[PDB]
Swiss-Prot record:
Full protein name: Casein kinase II subunit alpha
Residue span, Protein kinase domain: 37-322
PTM comment: Phosphorylation does not directly affect casein kinase 2 activity, but may contribute to its regulation by forming binding sites for interacting proteins and/or targeting it to different compartments.
Implicated disorder: Okur-Chung neurodevelopmental syndrome: An autosomal dominant neurodevelopmental disorder characterized by developmental delay, intellectual disability, behavioral problems, hypotonia, speech problems, microcephaly, pachygyria and variable dysmorphic features.
Residues annotated as catalytic: 154 (proton acceptor)
Principal location class: nucleus
Gene name of the encoded protein: CSNK2A1
Entry superkingdom: Eukaryota
Quaternary structure and partners: Heterotetramer composed of two catalytic subunits (alpha chain and/or alpha' chain) and two regulatory subunits (beta chains). The tetramer can exist as a combination of 2 alpha/2 beta, 2 alpha'/2 beta or 1 alpha/1 alpha'/2 beta subunits. Also part of a CK2-SPT16-SSRP1 complex composed of SSRP1, SUPT16H, CSNK2A1, CSNK2A2 and CSNK2B, which forms following UV irradiation. Interacts with RNPS1. Interacts with SNAI1. Interacts with PML (isoform PML-12). Interacts with CCAR2. Interacts with HIRIP3.
Length: 327
């Protein structure tokens, strides 16, 4: 069957920590006072929650309340434990409280509010310097959570809040996050389609933190090349074909061979034969201002089929692409 894999960094984190750290089922939730929060307006509704802007009436400060939809309780305790474990970490959203919603009778996660800049404005106007600056801020969040034995598994621009006025970034939406345990087989139905790593698309379950680094590369490619999304699959199968038209099919077959993966036969008629395209092929007059040899070298080291061959978040921080960023 498939050959096992383990991360090349932070494999022992959850072994060195006490069981209480990762055993989220055993965690006893400390419930706050639901009346401290007055809902102001609905901000959105996803598959797993309804999101509201609210006011903490004990300090008159804005908060965001995520009221969980009645779903599997195991997912809820996992997100709570991860948020508590990561609290105070660089650029990690702060979980301010956990209360029982009086209407839904389900948990409501209270977060610090970020006065976030409109997603479209960020995509359209962040400069070359700003992309490098904010990518460095995301790497601080990812190296932190990976160093804490957690993979985010849903890295994408809608999960990265920026209050541009205050040069403030927060990595949010930890609902798909998981503790990394070497040898564990994980569910491949994670991340948004355009950000799914090849490991997910080829149904390789023994993945790790490096999945986040692929997602980050997808985010970077779409920003610098002005191509939203960069890999535009019609479904999860066509998603792998879109990647193969850029990275080539030879390296894909080598990846499948190395990990002894049985590729879904549905791919035999759609993958075709493709050679890697040099990153310069995607440069044009409308994206030249965001492209540099350092950006292309960095992107090249994230977008690799072999999850063990990608830069880790800490190695990425050392890359020349960030030399210009004020530290
Ligand atoms: N801490 C926070 N501060 C401010 N706004 C927040 C915070 N957390 C979440 N939000 C906002 O809550 C809103 C609703 O979130 P939701 O997951 O339902 O939608 P979405 O982000 O637009 O979708 P998706 O990420 O799946 O594409 C979004 O506009 C998001 O920016
Ligand atoms: N794509 C897109 C827009 C966007 C939303 N949140 C971000 C966080 C970082 C970056 C960075 F500039 F660093 F790539 C971009 C965004």
């Amino acid at each position: 069957g498939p050959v096992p894999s383990r991360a090349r960094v932070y494999t022992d984190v959850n072994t060195h920590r006490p069981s209480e750290y990762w055993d989220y089922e055993s965690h006893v939730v400390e419930w706050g006072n639901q009346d401290d929060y007055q809902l102001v307006r609905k901000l959105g509704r996803g598959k797993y929650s309804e999101v509201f802007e609210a006011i903490n009436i004990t300090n008159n400060e804005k908060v965001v309340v995520k009221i969980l939809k009645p779903v599997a309780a195991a997912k809820i305790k996992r997100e709570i434990k991860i948020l508590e474990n990561l609290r105070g970490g660089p650029n990690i959203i702060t979980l301010a409280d956990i209360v029982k919603d009086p209407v839904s009778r389900t948990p409501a996660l209270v977060f610090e509010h970020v006065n976030n800049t409109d997603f479209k404005q960020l995509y359209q106007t962040l400069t070359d310097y700003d992309i490098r600056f904010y990518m460095y801020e995301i790497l601080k969040a990812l190296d932190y959570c990976h160093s804490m034995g957690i993979m985010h598994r849903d890295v994408k621009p809608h999960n990265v809040m920026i209050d541009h006025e205050h040069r403030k970034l927060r990595l949010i939406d930890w609902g798909l996050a998981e503790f990394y345990h070497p040898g564990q087989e994980y569910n491949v139905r994670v991340a948004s389609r355009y950000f799914k790593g090849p490991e997910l698309l080829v149904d390789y379950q023994m993945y790790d933190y490096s999945l986040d680094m692929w997602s980050l590369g997808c985010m970077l490619a779409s920003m610098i090349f002005r191509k939203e999304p960069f890999f535009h699959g019609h479904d999860n199968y066509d998603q792998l074909v879109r990647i193969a038209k850029v990275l080539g099919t030879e390296d894909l077959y080598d990846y499948i061979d190395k990990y002894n993966i049985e590729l879904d036969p549905r791919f035999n008629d759609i993958l075709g034969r493709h050679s890697r395209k040099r990153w310069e092929r995607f440069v044009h007059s409308e994206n030249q201002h965001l492209v540099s040899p350092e950006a292309l070298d960095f992107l090249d080291k994230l977008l690799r089929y072999d999850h063990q061959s990608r830069l880790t978040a800490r190695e990425a921080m050392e890359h020349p692409y960030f030399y210009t960023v004020v530290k």
